[PDB]
Structure formats: C-alpha cells, structure tokens
Amino acid sequence: NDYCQHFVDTGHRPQNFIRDIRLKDELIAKSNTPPMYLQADIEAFDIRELTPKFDVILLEPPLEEYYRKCWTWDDIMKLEIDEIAAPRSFIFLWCGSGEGLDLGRVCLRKWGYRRCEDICWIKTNKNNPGLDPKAVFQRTKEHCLMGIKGTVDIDLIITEEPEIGNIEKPVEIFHIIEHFCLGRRRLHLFGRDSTIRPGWLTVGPTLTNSNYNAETYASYFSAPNSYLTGCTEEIERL
Template sequence: MIVCRWFPGLVLQNLLTPSPFLSSGLADRFEEYPKLRELIRLKDELISTSNTPPMYLQADLETFDLRELKSEFDVILLEPPLEEYFRETGIAAHEKWWTWEDIMKLDIEGIAGSRAFVFLWCGSGEGLDFGRMCLRKWGFRRSEDICWIKTNKDNPGKTKTLDPKAIFQRTKEHCLMGIRGTVHRSTDGDFIHANVDIDLIITEEPEIGNIEKPVEIFHIIEHFCLGRRRLHLFGRDSTIRPGWLTVGPTLTNSNFNSEAYSSYFNAPNSTLTGCTEEIERLRPKTPPPKSDRGFGTARGGGRGGPPVGRGERGRERNRGSFRGDRGNFRGRGGPHRGGFAPR
C-alpha cells in the first residue's frame, strides 16, 4: 500500500489509496460543465452514426504481417501483455507475455497513415522508457501520457502481490500517445478535436489476474481523433467494438475481410467522421495570439490595447499553462511540447 505524503493518516486509517477521493466516472464527470456535457453527447451521436461495423481477426502477431490488413490507419491502440502485469498478479500467465524487443519489431510504421496517432499501454515501471523507444522506432513523437489511476474504493481491504522489481505498490498505469506527421490544433480541426477529455482515467482496479484496460480509453481516442480507420492490436473478444478493427491472438473468431473493410472508406464515404456546426461551436478552440486579444506589452499601456496592471499581466501570463479546461492533450511544459507544431 502506498502511503501518500499528502493524506498519510487517511490512507492508514481507511486502507484507501488517495485516488478514490478524486471525482471519476464518465456519467458524472461533466455535471458541472453543461456545455462540455452537451458536446460529449453530440460527439458520441456522430461517432455512432459514422462507425464502421466491428471487424476482428484472430492472428498471432509474432508471425502475422500487418501489411496484410491492406489499409493505413489513423489510430493504432496497442495493449501488449507485458511481463509486468503477470509479475504483479503473482499467478501464472494464461497467455504469452511480450518483451519490449518483440513489441518494437511490430511493423507499426508500415500501416500508419501520413498523419496518425499511436496509443501504447506500457505499464507503470520500465515500460515508460521502452515505450518511448518504440514510438521513436516507429516514427512517432511522444505527445502525451494518459494516466490510469486505480482505486480500491469498493474493496479497500484488497491486496495484491508486490512486484519484485518495485519498492512500493503501484496504483497507476500509463498509456503513451505518439503523433506522426504535422498536426496543428488551430488548423487541423478536421482531424483532431483537442481539449475535449482529460488525460486521466480513474476507475476501480480490476480483479487479480484481469489485465484488461478501462473502456474509457476508447472514448478518449474517439473524441480526440476524427479518423475512422482505427486498429486495436492485442484485442480480445471483450474489446470488439464498432468503428474498430480488432486483431489479437486470443480472439476466438474472425470476420475480417480486407476488401469489405476498405469499402467502408470509398467515395462517397470518407476516412473522417466529419463535424456538425453545433459541435464546432461547442468544442474548445486554441486561444488567439495575445496580439489578437488586444493586450499590450507595456505595463502602463502601449501597442495592442489599454493599460494592463500588474495583476492582469500575471493572470494573463499564467493562463496558457493552466490545466483547468477539463483536460487537454498538451504535453507538460507547454501546449507545443511533444509533437504538435507551433502556429
């Protein structure tokens, strides 16, 4: 059990990690933000009408040539069975776990579109460094780190095996997001809608031996990227989903046909979901440059607008790095770190 330095007494007395006291859940996350709640509803409706029928393929990814899918993809989600997951459970693996050397050999660069995103689940330990190496090898730039915080609110007495390679009990996992190509927040609204979701997932920790990831990762991806060609590698029967092609060794059936899949994107259809006027009106936009907002540079006034006091200058200077817009996909340290090109 990790004892948090901010809530040490709370953890010891209630046997709860601090994470259960954070707001969570898709249903009530935007209760205090009616515009965002309406935006999510409209986007979900559009996604459901533009989704392709679910397709799935049982394949051994060690030997399967991904180019046989005969398609490029806008989004690729990888959920490899890492050794780390089985070390933490303390039980024998019911499927083969993959080393990072094996994962790096996957031909992701050969099936990604000219502008595309990769989401790679990489655990909570050494996988963060190896995951970044995979992104670089595949031709992607790390753009974001989506963090899954695991709670034990429903079962506070539950314990699990301590990873032999860890000092503390780990209560989170990471999903690295990589970007390929040039994507501008302000001009590529046909392909991405940033700032819709937060980069944090808070859910109850699954039962011991269950290595499935939260379904919320699919919502985050679908709200963010408007590309319709979505691939899930290392998927299972439980993750088959409309709008996605699921490929994995543990699937029990297959219905994939490359010609049928490609036909979903032929004219008059598009590889993009599109956007409605109401969604465009509601979605968060990139703020205009300071010069367009009328703020001057001189303390007592000058070019660009009326006099600005010390307090106003401080608030304006700090506004760009404030992460209170209900989440975004900017990297730490500024909105352009990690792959998004500056305006």
C-alpha cells in the same frame, strides 16, 4: 489532509478521495464502420496484410506484469508498426507501470511518432483497502502513451482496481480516442472478443472468430468517405 499519510495509516489509496457532447457521441456512432475483427498470432503474422493504413492504432500487448503468451518489450519493439500507420496518424500504447514507461517511448520514436499525451489510469481500492524488486512505491496506476506522426477530455482515467487476473483496460480509453475525431480507420492490436467495438478493427491471438476481409474493409473508406474524421454526418448517396 495528507492522503499519503492516510494511505500509510489505513491502506486507502489517495485516489479513493478524488470527488466526481451527446450529439457528438451520436455522430461518432453514426459514422462508425461495422466492427471488424481477425484472429491472428501477431508474432507469426505479417501485419502488412492489415490494410489500408490506419489513422489510429491502439496497441495493448499482454505484458507479464499484468499477470500476478506474454509479450516482452523485446517482442513489442520489433513490431513493424510504421509499416501500417498512415503518414498522418496516431498511436495509443498501453505501457503498464514499470520499464514500459521508458521502453514504450523508445517504441513510439522507433515507429516514427512523438509523444503528445501521457494518459494515466489511476486505480482506486475503495472495495479492498490494504511488487517489482526495483519499485520504490506501491504502483497503483498504468500509463497509455499517445503518439502522433505527420502534421473535452482529461489525461486521467479513474476506476476501481479490477479483480486479480482481469487484464482488461478501461473502456474509457476508447471514449478519449474517439472524441479526438482522428479518422475512421482504427486498429486495436491485441484486442479480444470482449473489446470488439463498432468503428474498430480488432486483431489478436485469442479472438474466437474473424470477419475481416481487406477489400471489404477498404470499401468503408473509399470516396467520398476517404477523409472523414469520424465526428461528422454521413455523406448522402443516391
């Protein structure tokens, strides 16, 4: 069965035909910090005000291609991510489907990371079977690049294509990130009210409210909790 030919014949994407741990999710939920969030116009905001240095950064700049205030790769590459990343830390960068697959790699290296995974969000069109100038093929996926600096899941997320104008990325990316047990200082840049989550600090221009206080946030990670992975039991006090 050639699903490529089938797509040409019917408009059903090949991915439409792909078919088909709790205690760990529980420990992650137990060690999560309270959700913290800050409205900030990141083009005008000194991100060095975001402390302490993060173990994980999820970066979701609003690309123009998502719409069919947007950020260009010129804008993104000039973010000073290296100034808020911990010496050992990770980044997850949503790059879209076009020039971002190249420029996002330039960004990772500019900020001092090396790419260790390429996570592909594959979009089915089961509910609606049936266009960049340079494109050779219909683009039916997006890429989230994982980078590392310093010293159970698969690299695929499959969901139905969202309705037009919905720019949300699949919440499954958080599941992947959290299952790595990388540390508890987790930053989501260009998050929204709708993405706020326990265990994350969310910073973005469209947030309607803020609760972030740098001293309070830092107090979540002061000793003896400085080095927890986010997948182990809380440390007893008193």
